C-alpha cells in the first residue's frame, strides 16, 4: 500500500535530519537549507506493508510560494518544532497551522517535538536562561497538539534515534485509517 507524507516546520528545526535518519540510517554531517526533496522508505505496521513518499520542504520565508506545490495529494502531515526553541512552538498556530489547514483540510496532523536530547543539555539551558526561557515541556507540546486538533503528539531525537521509529508508525497508522 502506497502513502504520501509531507513534513513542515520552522528553519533548522530538524525536519531533514529526521527524514534522512529514518530512511538511510545516517545522520547528515553538513546542514544545508532545503529548497525541496523527495525520499522513499518501507514500513510494516499492524501486518500491513506500506511504501512511503517522504516530501521534504523548506522552512524559509523565501520559499513560501513553492512549498504549496507539494501539498496536492498528501495522506498525512508531520508538523514539527524544536525543543530548544520555544518560539518554533509558538509559530505552530501562527504560521503552519493556517497554511496547512487551508491547502490540506481533512488530513491527519502529527505534532512532533524534535531535538529531545537538548532538553537535558547544559549548554542549551544556559543560553536560554539569558532570554529568561527554558526548553519546551512535554505537557505544553501536548496542549498545543490538542488545541489544533492533532491526531497525536510525539517527541524524539534524530541524533540519538530515541523515538524516531514510533513517529513514523503513528504516521502510517493515521494515513491508513481515518
Ligand atoms: N541536537 C540535535 N540536533 C539536531 C537534531 N536533528 C537535527 N539537528 C541539527 O539541527 C540543525 C538543523 O537540522 P535540519 O534537519 O537541517 O533542519 P530543518 O528543519 O530541515 O531546516 P530547513 O531545511 O527548513 S532550513 C542541524 O545542524 C542538525 O544537525 C536532533 O535530534 N538533535
Ligand atoms: Mg531541511
UniProtKB/Swiss-Prot annotation:
Keyword Metal-binding attached: no
One GO MF term attached to the UniProt entry: G protein activity
Outcome (variant: residue 34 to A): Abolished monoglucosylation by C.difficile toxin TcdA. Abolished O-GlcNAcylation by C.novyi toxin TcdA
Signal peptide annotation: none
Keywords carried by this UniProt record: ADP-ribosylation, Cell cycle, Cell division, Cell membrane, Cell projection, Cytoplasm, Cytoskeleton, Disease variant, Ectodermal dysplasia, Glycoprotein, GTP-binding, Host-virus interaction, Hydrolase, Isopeptide bond, Lipoprotein, Magnesium, Membrane, Methylation, Nucleotide-binding, Nucleus, Phosphoprotein, Prenylation, Proto-oncogene, Ubl conjugation
Motif Effector region in this chain: 31-39
Stated consequence of mutating residue 132 to R: Reduced FBXL19-mediated ubiquitination and subsequent degradation
Pfam families: Ras
5-glutamyl serotonin modifications at: 60
GO biological process, one term: cell migration
Effect caused by changing residue 31 to F: Abolishes AMPylation by Haemophilus IbpA
Recorded catalytic activity of this chain's protein: GTP + H2O = GDP + phosphate + H(+)
Membership in a protein family: Belongs to the small GTPase superfamily. Rho family.
Connected disease: Ectodermal dysplasia with facial dysmorphism and acral, ocular, and brain anomalies: A neuroectodermal syndrome characterized by linear hypopigmentation, alopecia, apparently asymptomatic leukoencephalopathy, and facial, ocular, dental and acral anomalies. Patients show no intellectual or neurologic impairment.
Protein name according to UniProt: Transforming protein RhoA
Gene: RHOA
